[PDB]
Copies of this chain bind each other. A is one copy, B any other.
Amino acid sequence: ALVPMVIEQTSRGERSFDIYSRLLKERVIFLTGQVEDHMANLIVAQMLFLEAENPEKDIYLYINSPGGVITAGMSIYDTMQFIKPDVSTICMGQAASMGAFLLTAGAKGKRFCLPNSRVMIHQPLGGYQGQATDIEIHAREILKVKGRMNELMALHTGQSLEQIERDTERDRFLSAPEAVEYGLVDSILTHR
């Protein structure tokens, strides 16, 4: 049992699924670990599946991750915007870097976060080796990406673009109440 089994009664009954498949059936998706290319692809397959199961119901995305590859993260971002039903994002543990970015991309009014969680934002990282000509080609591309990420932050948070520009210079840490004040989440969940 790395992952335990659960049993559920329906019609015929029995029907024993996994501890994670049982939750996918409850329109629950978890995002954890680093955001890469093989894992992000699965998150997308799950969202497309749920969208085709019932276009009118929300999908809940639980976020707990330190960061990741911008490209992989953007495929998640765009699916989350394309599909018809709202995706409600919940931040538990941490949402840092690219994780924070995806957290704020949830449906407006449905961005929650648990009270002892942490959110951290910063500038995009990268690098390169090669001829001076190739160095200038790659340097311009990273700068364009940085600019694009800042615009999406301003769009989703309500902050001006310049305010976003200043707040991403160095690593910036926000407590759950600051995420609410700043505009990354709408509210803090407390008790059932």
Contacts and interface: CB of A to CB of B under 8 A. Distances in A.
A167 interface: no
Contacts of A37: 32-33, 64-66, 93
A78 B92 contact: yes
A6 B32 contact: no
The secondary structure that dominates the A interface is mixed
A166 interface: no
Contact of A116 (B44, B45, B78): B78
Copies of this subunit: 10
Contacts of A5: 17-18, 21, 24
Contact of A135 (B62, B126, B172): B126
Contacts of A109: none
Give the contact-size bracket for chain A: 35 or more
A2 B33 CA distance: 12
A19 B49 contact: yes
A124 interface: yes
Interface string A110-143: 0000111110001111111111111111111111
25 contacts: A1-B18, A3-B42, A4-B18, A4-B24, A5-B17, A5-B24, A6-B49, A12-B13, A33-B38, A37-B65, A40-B64, A40-B93, A55-B192, A75-B93, A78-B114, A78-B116, A78-B117, A84-B192, A123-B133, A126-B129, A126-B132, A128-B135, A133-B170, A137-B172, A138-B171
